């Protein structure tokens, strides 16, 4: 049949052959398919030099700025350089632009050498030299992008294929498909055949739904094809080449080999028999097991067996190999590099490495040796059954080093580890078990899976505490920065970064400056940077060699639990991995099974970063089968209570569900929740968000309360930052300098707070700023419904986590000039009683219960332990301590500077007087099953509002929950109602809503005295009740011999 080759046609003559001492360059003008008039080629140059590897030029040009290196001649095929030289021997130097810039990215070297004509041709950004236009004319020909899609067995889908005669698929086992010296394609290939998308394609993909199809004979070996490269090619009739472009093959490996392989089980699967390894890689050519001794030395290479149907490789051994170091070495085809890549991997199954997660080790995580005394015994302190047990869920969001990394109570060989949380004795913890005592049911734990921004060898790192002499032998940067001279001081850095602080401003930000520098070799970083999904880091650990951290950790969970009474969440991020690719370290999914764990844009394969980094694809099958082994063993071999997932919302609805079907068969009482933002891939597939994951019981954070309390949103800068006062910073009522807010955006606002409090649910009804009754869904948060929950225990609200600024910086940038000290630390305390006392799960940031500040950092991921650090000694809330990180919040230093000084640190004083408010709300919140009724049915009949409507008292919120007879049975023993009252406002204001109805102050905040929030409310006899400036009182009717009346929903 027609053999497929390059243009070969109208293919460019030479324009003119060098004479002698003299080299001619062509440049190719590809825009010669029609030509129909002359161009303009006089503002095209050469730039041309001779020094140490090539000097034949003679004469060459001066400086850069030189434009005067214009074309000898033209014509319709492009312009043509006559260079004078010295010698017909050697090589020169030469740079193909437009005026000034750089017509083509590097610095082409003609070689006499392997031209000997010294007649080359080049082409716009093209980076190669060609001994004719003939071969650059072609050149333009080759295979570019990766737009064609393998989905399945039989189907292609490919734009450039529709209309084109001749579309075939060709292959190469170890080459890479192109054209002979002849310039023509001689590989193999199948005959490709238009065809029409069937359903089960277009289901599975139906953002390619559209794209061109063609069909492949059944006879053919896929298996084969999928062991190298693929190209799809068009030709016309005649059998030229228009286009050829690269396959992914994710589609069809799902469709070969998914089923198969979904049936095994991976990793170094150890027993006290046996081990078996096993390792998920379809397309590889060969994969060999490397055994290493302790000392890293190879002991053995094992040539693996591959399993036809499933594509995995298997090898089986004795129980002498427990303990063992080991890597997969991988023969496998890249398509990013399209070479047929030999490296050696560590397993993505692996559950225990060596230091720095360089080797992985053979482990059985059910020995008792690894497991702390009585562990197989620990039991969950909190309940999650049922859906009002979920709802006492209290969240306390920590990190490992943010917990201790600062506490001297706590052994120096502890501070930022995991096993800080045993001494018992220690500032940190008696603070932790304070807050348990009071209220906080859970410890949500930022990434302590494997992540990979922190260098686990000791030797590399650096750390505040340390002498700057250490920072400047492990940071070269350091060195060479204007920091140099503290090197040989006898200084540690954290007293260097305190002395900077007095002469720190937006003007000389000189303590975010060298702070910037030490962030690259510390210890610290959030870790949302995956290396290995189902391994605990290492860097927590007192010796991050091999498997001495699986049992800290566990020591770490099981005090948390058994000695702490909390329940334990962990922060896990399947959504992208740390790297992609075959080159780096960190690439592990990417260099096994190429182009197939990782989201590729559609049209040039390369891996999406819409994440931040590198996009996973979860819609895959094998991925979706990792997650909920990896899962499995955090839930069966950890003990983990709960799951938070990061970005939720790019993993598709039905992965996320199936995968809570698996782990809830280990654990029924797990439970799950996580960011439902908007990640458009909606075209993809239906994702895991707010809306569509309504009525399933997987939770979401909220956005709605949080931002109506807060005031603005995460994206605010500038002046916004000030401008958008929140509920709990005065909106409406105490108006800074600067805001434009009017009253109504003030009410709409607690429309939202409202509806939050009352589980954020879809069909709540209440009644609206100007009246009007509405269910939550037709309350607008920013365009969008803004109730959308079947049940408050879908819903997770809060007013501070580790992402954005926190409470304190934002009370703090949005604080009216004449609200003091006290009242701010009252607009904190009121602000998270919102959430606190609300019917959605809360949750909070580590610190809020102290005025927690990161100077105002808004990122602060890898900011260190500077601007993370929380002092549970109480001296100060870490405010005002330098300006922040200028690369994200340098936009910010001039409203920073403005707003910063108003009041007074906190100190002592203030940080214990919230802690007490604090406990005060957790402890309110536990103290009867009205605040936590679960059920949005149950909420609906018993949550109601007062001060509603546009007669209504700006800032105050009355919330009322009925237990009397119109609700249904007494859910409370002692007594018949619950009213909640926020008073976000300067004034003092009465309540005239229960006059006579006997209405009597929790006796928790009674027995605070004034000490408490509700320090100063006063019930009268009229029944009346009036509640002090910034304050929160919680009322009770209490219950006589027989339920009484209570507090009935009003119909609406
Ligand atoms: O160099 C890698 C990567 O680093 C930076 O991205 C980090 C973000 O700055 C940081 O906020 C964090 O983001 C996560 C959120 O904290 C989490 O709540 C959720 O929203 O997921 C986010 C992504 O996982 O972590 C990332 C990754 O470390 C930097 O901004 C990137 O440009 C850079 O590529
Ligand atoms: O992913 C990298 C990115 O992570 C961090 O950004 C997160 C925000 O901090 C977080 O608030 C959230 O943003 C969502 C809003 O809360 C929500 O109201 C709505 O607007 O959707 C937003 C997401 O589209 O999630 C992002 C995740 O990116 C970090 O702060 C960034 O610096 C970083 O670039
Ligand atoms: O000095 C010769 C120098 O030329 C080239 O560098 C250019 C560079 O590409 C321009 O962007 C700009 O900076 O001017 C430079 C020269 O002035 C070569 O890349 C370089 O190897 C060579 O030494
Ligand atoms: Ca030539
Ligand atoms: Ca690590
Ligand atoms: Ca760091
Ligand atoms: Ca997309
Ligand atoms: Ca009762």
């Known amino acids: ?106 610095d082409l070297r003609v070689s006499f050498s392997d031209f000997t004509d010294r007649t080359v041709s080049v082409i716009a950004g093209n980076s190669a030299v060609y001994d004719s236009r003939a071969d650059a004319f072609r050149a333009a020909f080759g295979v570019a992008l990766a737009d064609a899609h393998w989905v399945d067995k039989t189907t292609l889908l490919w734009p450039g294929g529709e209309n084109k005669p001749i579309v075939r698929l060709y292959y190469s086992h170890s080459s890479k498909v192109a054209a002979d010296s002849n310039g023509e394609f001689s590989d193999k290939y199948v005959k490709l055949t238009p065809t029409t998308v069937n359903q089960q394609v277009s289901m599975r993909f139906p953002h390619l739904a559209s794209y061109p199809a063609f069909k492949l004979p059944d006879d053919v070996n896929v298996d084969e094809l999928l062991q ?86 298997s090898w089986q051994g004795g129980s002498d190999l427990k303990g063992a170091f080991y890597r997969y070495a991988m023969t496998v085809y890249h398509p990013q590099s399209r070479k047929v890549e030999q490296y050696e991997v560590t397993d993505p199954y692996a559950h ?32 999650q059954k049922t859906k009002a047990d979920l709802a006492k869920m209290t969240i306390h969001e920590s990190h490992i080093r943010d917990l201790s990394a600062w506490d001297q109570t706590v052994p120096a060989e502890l501070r930022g580890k995991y096993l800080a949380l045993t001494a018992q004795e220690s500032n940190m913890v008696q603070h932790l078990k304070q807050l348990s005592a009071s209220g906080v049911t859970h410890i949500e734990l930022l990434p302590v899976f494997d992540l990979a921004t922190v260098n686990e060898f000791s030797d590399k790192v650096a750390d505040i505490q340390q002498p700057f002499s250490r920072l400047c032998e492990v940071n070269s940067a350091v060195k060479s920065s204007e920091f140099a001279g ?21 003007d000389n930000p000189q303590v975010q400056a060298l702070n910037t520098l030490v962030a690259q070799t510390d210890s610290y970083n959030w870790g949302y940077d995956p290396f290995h999904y189902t391994v605990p880091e290492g860097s927590y650990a007192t010796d991050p060699e091999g498997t001495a951290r699986i049992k800290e950790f566990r020591t770490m969970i099981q005090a948390i639990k058994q000695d702490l009474g909390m329940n334990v969440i962990m922060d896990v991020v399947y959504n992208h991995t740390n790297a992609a690719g075959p080159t780096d370290r960190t690439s592990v999914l990417d260099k096994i099974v190429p182009w197939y764990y990782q989201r590729l844009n559609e049209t040039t394969g390369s891996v999406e970063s819409a994440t931040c980094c590198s996009d996973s694809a979860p819609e895959h099958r094998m991925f979706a089968k990792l997650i909920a082994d990896s899962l499995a063993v955090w839930t069966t071999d950890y003990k983990i209570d709960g799951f938070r997932f990061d970005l939720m919302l790019y993993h598709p609805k039905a992965q996320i569900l199936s995968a809570w079907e698996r782990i809830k068969a ?174 959605g799960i809360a949750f909070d940031q580590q610190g809020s219960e102290l005025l927690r500040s990161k100077s105002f950092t808004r990122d602060s ?35 920073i500077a403005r707003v910063k000084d108003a009041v007074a640190t906190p100190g002592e004083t203030e940080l214990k007087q919230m802690t007490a408010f604090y406990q005060e709300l957790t402890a309110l919140r536990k103290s009867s099953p009205l605040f936590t009724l679960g059920d949005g049915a149950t909420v609906m009949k018993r949550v109601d509002f007062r001060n509603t409507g546009a007669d209504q008292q700006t800032g105050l919120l009355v919330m009322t929950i009925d237990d009397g007879m119109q609700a249904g ?19 003092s204001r009465t309540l005239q809503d229960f006059a006579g109805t006997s209405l009597q102050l929790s006796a928790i905040q009674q027995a605070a005295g004034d000490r408490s929030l509700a320090s100063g409310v006063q019930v009268a006899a009229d029944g009346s009740v009036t509640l002090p400036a910034w304050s929160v009182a919680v009322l009770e009717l209490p219950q006589g011999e027989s339920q009484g009346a209570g507090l009935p929903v009003s119909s609406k």
């Open 1 to 106: 049949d027609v053999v497929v080759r390059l243009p070969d046609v109208a293919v460019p003559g030479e324009a003119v052959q060098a004479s002698a001492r003299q080299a001619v360059i062509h440049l190719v003008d590809i825009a010669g398919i029609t030509s129909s008039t002359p161009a303009d080629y006089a503002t095209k140059n050469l730039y041309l030099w001779n020094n140490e590897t090539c000097d034949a030029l003679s004469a060459p040009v001066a400086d850069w700025n030189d434009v005067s290196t214009t074309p000898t001649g033209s014509d319709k095929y492009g312009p043509y350089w006559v260079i004078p030289l010295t010698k017909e021997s050697g090589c020169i130097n030469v740079i193909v632009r437009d005026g000034t810039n750089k017509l083509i990215d590097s």
């Open 969 to 987: 049975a007494s859910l409370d023993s002692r007594v018949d109602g619950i009213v909640v009252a926020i008073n976000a406002a300067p004034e």
């Open 228 to 313: 190298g490269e693929t190209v799809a090619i068009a030709a016309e009739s005649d059998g030229i080449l228009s286009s050829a472009t690269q396959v992914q093959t994710a589609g069809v490996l799902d469709d070969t080999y998914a089923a198969a392989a979904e049936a095994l089980s991976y990793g170094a699967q150890l027993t006290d028999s046996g081990v078996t390894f096993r390792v998920w890689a379809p397309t590889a050519q060969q994969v060999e097991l490397v055994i290493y001794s302790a000392d890293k030395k190879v002991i053995a290479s094992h040539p693996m067996t591959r399993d036809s149907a499933s594509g995995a490789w």
């Open 486 to 506: 503290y090197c040989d001081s006898g200084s540690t850095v954290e007293e260097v970064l305190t002395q900077l602080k007095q002469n720190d401003s937006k």
């Open 861 to 895: 991921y890898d900011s260190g332990d500077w601007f993370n650090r929380v002092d549970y000694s109480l001296q100060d809330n870490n405010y005002n301590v330098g300006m922040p990180r200028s690369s994200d919040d340098g936009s910010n230093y001039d409203i």
């Open 666 to 839: 280990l654990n029924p009482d797990i439970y799950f929740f996580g960011e439902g933002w908007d990640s458009n891939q909606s075209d993809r597939f239906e994702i895991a968000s707010q809306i569509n994951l309504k009525g399933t019981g997987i939770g979401t954070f909220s956005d709605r309360l949080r931002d109506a309390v807060r005031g603005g949103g995460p994206f605010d800068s500038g002046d916004a930052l000030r401008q958008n006062q929140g509920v709990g910073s005065g909106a409406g009522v105490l108006p800074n300098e600067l805001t434009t807010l009017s009253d109504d955006q003030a009410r709409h606002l607690a429309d939202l707070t409202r509806l939050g409090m009352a589980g954020n649910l879809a069909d709540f009804v209440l009644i609206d700023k100007d009246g009007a009754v509405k269910r939550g869904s037709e309350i607008d948060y920013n365009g969008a419904p803004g109730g959308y929950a079947a049940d408050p225990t879908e819903v997770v609200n809060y007013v501070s986590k580790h992402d954005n600024q926190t409470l304190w910086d934002m009370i703090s940038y949005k604080a009216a000039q004449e609200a003091d000290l006290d009242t701010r630390v009252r607009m904190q305390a009121v602000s998270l009683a919102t959430v606190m006392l609300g019917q």
């Open 352 to 383: 225990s490495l060596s230091t720095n997660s360089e080797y992985s080790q053979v482990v059985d995580l059910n020995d008792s040796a690894l497991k702390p005394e009585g562990w197989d015994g620990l039991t969950m302190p909190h309940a």
